[PDB]
Design an enzyme around this catalytic site. Structure first.
Site, mmCIF file in Angstrom:
data_model
loop_
_atom_site.group_PDB
_atom_site.id
_atom_site.type_symbol
_atom_site.label_atom_id
_atom_site.label_comp_id
_atom_site.label_asym_id
_atom_site.label_seq_id
_atom_site.Cartn_x
_atom_site.Cartn_y
_atom_site.Cartn_z
ATOM 1 N N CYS A 48 -9.985 -18.021 -6.356
ATOM 2 C CA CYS A 48 -8.644 -18.537 -6.624
ATOM 3 C C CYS A 48 -7.630 -17.394 -6.550
ATOM 4 O O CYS A 48 -7.906 -16.283 -7.012
ATOM 5 C CB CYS A 48 -8.548 -19.230 -7.975
ATOM 6 S SG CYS A 48 -9.557 -20.732 -8.126
ATOM 7 N N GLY B 63 -14.147 -17.671 -8.304
ATOM 8 C CA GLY B 63 -13.474 -16.377 -8.382
ATOM 9 C C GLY B 63 -12.557 -16.105 -7.188
ATOM 10 O O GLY B 63 -11.883 -15.077 -7.150
ATOM 11 N N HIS C 257 -3.276 -21.614 -13.435
ATOM 12 C CA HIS C 257 -4.432 -22.025 -14.234
ATOM 13 C C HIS C 257 -5.217 -20.832 -14.777
ATOM 14 O O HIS C 257 -6.131 -21.015 -15.558
ATOM 15 C CB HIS C 257 -5.315 -23.049 -13.502
ATOM 16 C CG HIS C 257 -6.031 -22.535 -12.316
ATOM 17 N ND1 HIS C 257 -7.106 -21.677 -12.429
ATOM 18 C CD2 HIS C 257 -5.874 -22.772 -11.021
ATOM 19 C CE1 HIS C 257 -7.567 -21.397 -11.225
ATOM 20 N NE2 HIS C 257 -6.826 -22.040 -10.357
#
Ligand SMILES: C[C@H](c1ccccc1)N1CC(=O)N(c2cncc(Br)c2)C1=O
Ligand SMILES: C[C@H](c1ccccc1)N1CC(=O)N(c2cncc(Br)c2)C1=O
Lengths: 302, 301
Positions: B145, B143, B41
């Site tokens: 991820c 942030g 993503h």
């Protein structure tokens, strides 16, 4: 979201841990530049440990009587001396992985990360607080001595703890990196005990502020209190006094949640008097006191 | 003695964390040899969230659209592909700090350490379990991820989790390092929700065996149970069924304490019925289910 007992990343400290052997005693040391720091009791046997004369035991040892291993590699000891309850061994090679660091002495209520090690080999990391009675609630077996505690305050490692011993109640005692004990303990096999402990009030409030931030609100109420009234209540429940310094320190969290410290103290008052009436807070049925204000801000912002 | 939620030393994994940027999106990636693994993503915009067509978004990207930064240094991306829900970016330099490693897909109930990171820089380390509903109860901001979960069960790092997203209940969903999600989750902002969670029975028993080992005995009783009767009672408190595999697995702790598994099961029934009446067990007023049999053996003896 989420709130967890969180340790500093341990990598900078992993690259300083070494094995130190003297006689049949093996334990952990900390290799920074060309010096290895470890508990001085490494030089004692069982009999010696009963009533040691460290000065006398040390002068009988040559450099070559200390075997120091970093991984598979031996380090040559070229010098040896003592500072309080820590032995400093000068070695032939500076540690290439030496991080930026300082030795600091922490206050009761302040937290730090512990890297537990066995035979100079790091096995685990966890977060601890220095209890009011100067003990830590750690997890340590035989061979853990010389394991260290630290904070990372920028890229700089602040070493604050070296593990020396376990007390009969299963809690732990050690020194700063200048070899001064936390609490009224000595490095010998005699009868020692933790004094009765208290709860770290300021940390409990910080953890209440963390619970609010994570959407846990049921214990807020319309009430407020004064410092003195609250302190009368705290003393009764074996909580540390709360000072104006504590209130100032909580200022950030107060502002960010719109709950004044003394208002949050009113919630804590009520929890102490009435209990939790079946409910939990951040997954706990007890009030957690091992997160500092700074720890909360750090995990709920940084 | 003592007993603590203990994470693995994080340094072997710190040496692998990098920052990955695509457009205005920055998140974390894992640099192993000459490949960087991150959530796919990273390539999605404001629009893309609801119904992303990843194949279509990816074909429109060149290598030089991916900025990868390891500390001070930029890495040159020389190739890219997608595997399930992870992007694999080939880079020009092998990671010199690459540890011995493998990828493993874990089962519900298994524990692991998380290195939480922001901007490719590590922030903290903590211990987590894969919940029965295939979520984890982590601590993760925007942030985070691409932060990873792992075990180190000798000198070898076993990567088992990559963080992708937070669900509305504040728990966390992610993939193995081959990009397959744990649970029925998808990297899409649609209404999706964690199934009801259960307690990990086998782990609670392991932790009871740990409390015995550390000298704590008050919760035992003189009773036993059948496996089936134990499961009929446990289900009523939202506990996972215990299976014969679970019982076998607890054998070593049974032998070390002289308490049969089904005897310890009888004790758990009683604790569920009575609670603890002001007592604690290894410092907890609740029954802990985030330590495995293996974890107890590792920390105790
Ligand atoms: C006996 C000796 C000692 C006594 C008094 C002062 C200093 C040392 N040791 C050695 C040792 O390994 N530990 C230890 C440390 N943590 C956890 C566990 Br279980 C044991 C000790 O207490
Ligand atoms: C919105 C996006 C996303 C949604 C669904 C599927 C994949 C990505 N992100 C980005 C981001 O940083 N996180 C996140 C992760 N952990 C904790 C927190 Br708080 C936020 C997300 O959920």
């Amino acid at each position: 979201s989420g709130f967890r007992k969180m340790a500093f990343p341990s990598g900078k400290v992993e690259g300083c841990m070494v094995q130190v052997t003297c006689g049949t005693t093996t334990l952990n040391g900390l290799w920074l530049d060309d010096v290895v720091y470890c508990p001085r009791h490494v030089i004692c046997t069982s009999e010696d440990m009963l009533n040691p004369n460290y000065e006398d035991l040390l002068i009988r040892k040559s450099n070559h009587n200390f075997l120091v291993q970093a991984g598979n590699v031996q380090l040559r000891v070229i010098g040896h001396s003592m500072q309080n309850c820590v032995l400093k061994l000068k070695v032939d090679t500076a540690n290439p992985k030496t991080p930026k660091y300082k030795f600091v002495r922490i206050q009761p209520g302040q937290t730090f990360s512990v890297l537990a090690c066995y035979n100079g080999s790091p096995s685990g990391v966890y977060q601890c607080a220095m209890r009011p009675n100067f003990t830590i609630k750690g997890s340590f077996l035989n061979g853990s001595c010389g394991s260290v505690g630290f904070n990372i305050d920028y890229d700089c490692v602040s070493f604050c703890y070296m593990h020396h011993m376990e007390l009969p109640t299963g809690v732990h005692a050690g020194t700063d990196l200048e070899g001064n004990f936390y609490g009224p303990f000595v490095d010998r096999q005699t009868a020692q005990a933790a004094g009765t402990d208290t709860t770290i009030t300021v940390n409990v409030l910080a953890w209440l502020y963390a619970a609010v931030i994570n959407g846990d609100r049921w214990f807020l109420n319309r009430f407020t209190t004064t410092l003195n009234d609250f302190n009368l209540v705290a003393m009764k429940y074996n909580y540390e006094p709360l000072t104006q310094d504590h209130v100032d320190i909580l200022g950030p969290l107060s502002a960010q949640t719109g709950i004044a410290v003394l208002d949050m103290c009113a919630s804590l008052k009520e929890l102490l008097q009435n209990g939790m009436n079946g409910r939990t807070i951040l997954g706990s049925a007890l009030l957690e006191d091992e997160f500092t204000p700074f720890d909360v801000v750090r995990q709920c912002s940084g």
